[PDB]
Amino acid sequence: EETRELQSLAAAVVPSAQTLKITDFSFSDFELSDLETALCTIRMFTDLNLVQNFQMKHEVLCRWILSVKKNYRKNVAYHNWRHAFNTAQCMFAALKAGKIQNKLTDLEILALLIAALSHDLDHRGVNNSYIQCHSIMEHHHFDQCLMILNSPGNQILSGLSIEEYKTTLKIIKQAILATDLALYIKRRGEFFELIRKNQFNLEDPHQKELFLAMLMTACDLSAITKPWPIQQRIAELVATEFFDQGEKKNKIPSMQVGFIDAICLQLYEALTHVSEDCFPLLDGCRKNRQKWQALAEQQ
Ligand SMILES: O=c1c2c(F)cccc2oc2c(Cc3ccc4c(c3)OCO4)[nH]c(-c3nccs3)c12
Ligand SMILES: [Mg+2]
């Protein structure tokens, strides 16, 4: 039963962030059970002071994490719980190892972590896009997020005041909507020009919101930064979703270089200017570009 999964999770000991390796940008989840990802997720909340500062009951958080996990589709090859889990893991690593934690409020951190885990809820697959611009899919991901956040027993934000709740919901909404790459493509120019001119200032509310959005995209796409054998396997999953609805290997390397140049490099370059300790994401992205390019030239 589902409630048997909850007992095991609620009862278990949550090992530290160091043991779980969740502070490392190089993190991988291929060796982890579903239960183990749920533990790493508890430790993320815990070591960001979110359980303390917003008074989350253990039983509620556990049930919430499991509800979230249930609302991804495992038959979808890439856009599933593991991608969401990894996205949140990258957010955690960017906050701790990347030293972004200090540049944000606790409400912003809570919203990003929840948004990261929720940002692709009930995704059907890039191909399976039959419904019934304005970023329609991300609106549905947020609706799912909200539906779970309001479910009996899953209300991890009950400890917030009414004002804190509405702010956090606003930030969560913005953050999930930022994972539409069309919005990323539309807003990134400003971010890059504000970093190029040395005019970047997080005290400005508009520039904070813009940064929260760019951070979300950095985490969402961070599989492109992983060590080569991890990257290859995650590329393989993406390909299974893009093709097989669940000669081929000729074109893949060139596309990966195309995607890195078009979307990824500038973002990770920009993020590194904001905080130098996020360099490993840029570095890992460059190393993967080198490797795909070598394959693209017929190695
Ligand atoms: O995460 C993405 C990705 C995305 F998020 C949103 C939109 C497009 C994307 O394309 C991606 C490629 C390029 C690509 C495009 C089409 C393909 C393909 C590879 O293989 C088969 O068909 N690589 C990755 C990753 N690779 C590693 C981690 S993320 C992709
Ligand atoms: Mg998405």
Short mmCIF file of all heavy atoms in Angstrom, two decimals, residues 208-229:
data_model
loop_
_atom_site.label_atom_id
_atom_site.label_comp_id
_atom_site.label_asym_id
_atom_site.label_seq_id
_atom_site.Cartn_x
_atom_site.Cartn_y
_atom_site.Cartn_z
N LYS A 208 15.85 40.71 -8.88
CA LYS A 208 15.75 39.51 -8.04
C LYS A 208 14.88 38.45 -8.72
O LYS A 208 15.29 37.30 -8.86
CB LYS A 208 15.18 39.86 -6.65
CG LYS A 208 15.05 38.69 -5.67
CD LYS A 208 16.39 38.20 -5.14
CE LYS A 208 16.86 39.01 -3.94
NZ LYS A 208 16.24 38.57 -2.66
N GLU A 209 13.69 38.86 -9.13
CA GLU A 209 12.75 38.00 -9.85
C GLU A 209 13.39 37.40 -11.11
O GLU A 209 13.27 36.21 -11.38
CB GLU A 209 11.50 38.80 -10.21
CG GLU A 209 10.42 38.04 -10.97
CD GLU A 209 9.17 38.86 -11.24
OE1 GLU A 209 9.14 40.08 -10.92
OE2 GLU A 209 8.20 38.29 -11.79
N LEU A 210 14.08 38.25 -11.88
CA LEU A 210 14.81 37.83 -13.08
C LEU A 210 15.87 36.76 -12.75
O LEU A 210 16.00 35.78 -13.49
CB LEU A 210 15.47 39.04 -13.75
CG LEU A 210 16.19 38.83 -15.09
CD1 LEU A 210 15.20 38.47 -16.18
CD2 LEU A 210 16.98 40.08 -15.48
N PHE A 211 16.60 36.96 -11.65
CA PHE A 211 17.62 36.02 -11.19
C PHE A 211 17.03 34.68 -10.73
O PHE A 211 17.56 33.61 -11.05
CB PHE A 211 18.46 36.63 -10.07
CG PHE A 211 19.43 35.67 -9.45
CD1 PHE A 211 20.54 35.22 -10.17
CD2 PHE A 211 19.23 35.18 -8.17
CE1 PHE A 211 21.43 34.32 -9.62
CE2 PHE A 211 20.13 34.27 -7.61
CZ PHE A 211 21.22 33.84 -8.33
N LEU A 212 15.93 34.75 -9.96
CA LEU A 212 15.19 33.55 -9.54
C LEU A 212 14.76 32.71 -10.75
O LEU A 212 14.90 31.50 -10.73
CB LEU A 212 13.96 33.92 -8.69
CG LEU A 212 14.15 34.63 -7.34
CD1 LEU A 212 12.80 34.78 -6.64
CD2 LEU A 212 15.13 33.90 -6.44
N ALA A 213 14.27 33.37 -11.79
CA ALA A 213 13.92 32.70 -13.04
C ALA A 213 15.12 32.05 -13.73
O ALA A 213 15.03 30.92 -14.20
CB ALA A 213 13.24 33.68 -14.00
N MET A 214 16.24 32.77 -13.80
CA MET A 214 17.44 32.25 -14.48
C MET A 214 18.05 31.09 -13.71
O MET A 214 18.57 30.14 -14.32
CB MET A 214 18.50 33.35 -14.65
CG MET A 214 18.09 34.49 -15.57
SD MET A 214 17.99 34.06 -17.31
CE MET A 214 16.24 34.33 -17.61
N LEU A 215 17.99 31.16 -12.38
CA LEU A 215 18.45 30.09 -11.51
C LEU A 215 17.63 28.82 -11.73
O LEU A 215 18.18 27.71 -11.80
CB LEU A 215 18.38 30.53 -10.05
CG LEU A 215 18.96 29.61 -8.97
CD1 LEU A 215 20.43 29.29 -9.23
CD2 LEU A 215 18.78 30.27 -7.61
N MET A 216 16.32 28.98 -11.86
CA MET A 216 15.43 27.86 -12.12
C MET A 216 15.82 27.13 -13.39
O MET A 216 15.87 25.91 -13.39
CB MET A 216 13.96 28.31 -12.22
CG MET A 216 13.31 28.59 -10.87
SD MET A 216 13.16 27.14 -9.80
CE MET A 216 12.00 26.13 -10.72
N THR A 217 16.07 27.90 -14.45
CA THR A 217 16.48 27.33 -15.74
C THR A 217 17.85 26.64 -15.63
O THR A 217 18.05 25.58 -16.21
CB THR A 217 16.47 28.39 -16.88
OG1 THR A 217 15.11 28.79 -17.14
CG2 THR A 217 17.03 27.83 -18.18
N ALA A 218 18.77 27.23 -14.87
CA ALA A 218 20.10 26.64 -14.67
C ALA A 218 19.99 25.26 -14.03
O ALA A 218 20.69 24.33 -14.44
CB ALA A 218 20.98 27.54 -13.83
N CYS A 219 19.11 25.14 -13.04
CA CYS A 219 18.87 23.86 -12.36
C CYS A 219 18.13 22.87 -13.26
O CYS A 219 18.48 21.69 -13.31
CB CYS A 219 18.09 24.08 -11.06
SG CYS A 219 19.04 24.99 -9.83
N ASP A 220 17.10 23.37 -13.94
CA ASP A 220 16.28 22.58 -14.87
C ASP A 220 17.15 21.92 -15.95
O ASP A 220 16.99 20.74 -16.25
CB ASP A 220 15.19 23.48 -15.49
CG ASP A 220 14.14 22.73 -16.30
OD1 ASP A 220 13.94 21.51 -16.14
OD2 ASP A 220 13.47 23.41 -17.10
N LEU A 221 18.11 22.66 -16.50
CA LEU A 221 18.99 22.15 -17.55
C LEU A 221 20.30 21.51 -17.07
O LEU A 221 21.08 21.07 -17.91
CB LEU A 221 19.33 23.28 -18.53
CG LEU A 221 18.14 24.03 -19.13
CD1 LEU A 221 18.67 25.11 -20.05
CD2 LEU A 221 17.17 23.10 -19.85
N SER A 222 20.52 21.41 -15.75
CA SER A 222 21.83 21.05 -15.17
C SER A 222 22.36 19.62 -15.48
O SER A 222 23.54 19.34 -15.28
CB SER A 222 21.84 21.27 -13.65
OG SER A 222 20.79 20.56 -13.02
N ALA A 223 21.50 18.75 -15.99
CA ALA A 223 21.97 17.47 -16.50
C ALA A 223 23.07 17.61 -17.58
O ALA A 223 23.88 16.70 -17.76
CB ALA A 223 20.82 16.67 -17.05
N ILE A 224 23.07 18.75 -18.27
CA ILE A 224 24.08 19.08 -19.28
C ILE A 224 25.46 19.40 -18.67
O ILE A 224 26.46 19.43 -19.39
CB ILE A 224 23.56 20.24 -20.20
CG1 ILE A 224 24.26 20.24 -21.56
CG2 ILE A 224 23.69 21.59 -19.52
CD1 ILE A 224 23.99 19.03 -22.42
N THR A 225 25.51 19.62 -17.35
CA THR A 225 26.75 19.95 -16.65
C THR A 225 27.43 18.73 -16.02
O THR A 225 28.57 18.83 -15.56
CB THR A 225 26.48 20.95 -15.52
OG1 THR A 225 25.75 20.30 -14.47
CG2 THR A 225 25.69 22.16 -16.02
N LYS A 226 26.74 17.59 -15.98
CA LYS A 226 27.19 16.45 -15.21
C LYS A 226 28.46 15.83 -15.79
O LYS A 226 28.80 16.10 -16.95
CB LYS A 226 26.08 15.39 -15.13
CG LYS A 226 24.82 15.84 -14.39
CD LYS A 226 25.11 16.07 -12.90
CE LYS A 226 23.87 16.46 -12.12
NZ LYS A 226 24.22 16.86 -10.73
N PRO A 227 29.18 15.01 -15.01
CA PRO A 227 30.33 14.29 -15.58
C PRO A 227 29.94 13.41 -16.78
O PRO A 227 28.83 12.89 -16.84
CB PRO A 227 30.83 13.43 -14.42
CG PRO A 227 30.41 14.18 -13.20
CD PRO A 227 29.07 14.76 -13.56
N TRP A 228 30.87 13.27 -17.73
CA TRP A 228 30.58 12.72 -19.05
C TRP A 228 29.71 11.44 -19.08
O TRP A 228 28.69 11.41 -19.78
CB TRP A 228 31.89 12.54 -19.83
CG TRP A 228 31.75 11.90 -21.18
CD1 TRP A 228 32.36 10.77 -21.61
CD2 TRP A 228 30.94 12.37 -22.26
NE1 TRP A 228 31.99 10.50 -22.90
CE2 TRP A 228 31.12 11.46 -23.33
CE3 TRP A 228 30.09 13.46 -22.45
CZ2 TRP A 228 30.48 11.61 -24.56
CZ3 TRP A 228 29.45 13.61 -23.67
CH2 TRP A 228 29.65 12.69 -24.71
N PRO A 229 30.09 10.38 -18.33
CA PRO A 229 29.25 9.18 -18.34
C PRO A 229 27.83 9.41 -17.81
O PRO A 229 26.90 8.76 -18.27
CB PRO A 229 30.00 8.18 -17.45
CG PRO A 229 31.37 8.74 -17.29
CD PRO A 229 31.23 10.23 -17.40
#
